[model samples]
Target: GLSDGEWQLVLNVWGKVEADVAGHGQEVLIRLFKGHPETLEKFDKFKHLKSEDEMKASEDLKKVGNTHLTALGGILKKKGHHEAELTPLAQSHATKHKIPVKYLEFISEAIIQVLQSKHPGDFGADAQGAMSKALELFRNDMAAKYKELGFQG
Candidate 1:
């Protein structure tokens, strides 16, 4: 569970970034692909985009990225009640995509990177710690559900 201050940090940071969800989503997804190039293999539509510029130009990339960012922003808005929303997403990843839990964990780095880049000085120690904790809890919950579907981390 997140403390009130942690929730505030998430809300403040997400609110700031969500203002330009398209750019933020593009950057975050691009960062993920650049950092873990093979992860793109999971998304058939995105795997062919060879460069960041190409990714930015891709409509498919734009839609998927925006969807993820919007869902994330929604979860942040729900405060501690996000589990109900998150569980369905976890199930979809497990059943439809068969995405390994490791791939899910990999996104954490991209999220932190994107936050630091966008927020600069604002995403300081406190924000980073709170975000990390929030992501950890999210991942753990997803991992448990993924395991139930026979996927290992």
Candidate 2:
């Protein structure tokens, strides 16, 4: 599984565009963005909440948070393995994090908002730079939280 930083680095290279593979120097190229299989499991946890009767306000939120990290990992793995997975991964992350799904979708939108606000998409000759930077900051925040909880890994 890729660290958040690694995920962001690859995403920065390819925006909404899907990932692909091409052999280079006799190597079998394989590109994956959202390759973590654990993500699907986490996603199932969140999506199937109604059956467990564990409300968001219940004690299970912490569990959800734990799985959320796993889901994030899955997104990275899937994206790295399959370029097309990035768009949905971004969408899923956004919707899952939002308090209310109807209003906004992904963190990418917020990133895009900042980009749009700052002189349109003309962001210093590198349109994707802002997104990658934002992801780096997001990953740093997650890392700090994990550390604060006495992260074992």
What's the true lDDT of residue 46 in model 2?
42
Candidate 1 lDDT over residue span 28-119, tens digit each: 88999999998899898886788888988997787788888898788777776777898888888888877888886788889899999888
Model 2: per-residue Cα lDDT over 94-121, one tens digit each: 4453222211123334334433443343
| Poorest 10 consecutive residues by lDDT, candidate 1 | 144-153
Q: Cα deviation of 59 in candidate 1 (Å)?
A: 2.1
Candidate 1 off by > 4 Å: none
Count clashing residue pairs in model 2: 23
TM-score of each: 0.93, 0.28
Best candidate (score: TM-score): 1
lDDT of 1: 0.84
Q: Considering only N, C-alpha and C atoms within 3 Å, which residue pairs clash in candidate 1?
A: none
Task: Give candidate 2 regions above 4 Å deviation.
Answer: 1-34, 46-125
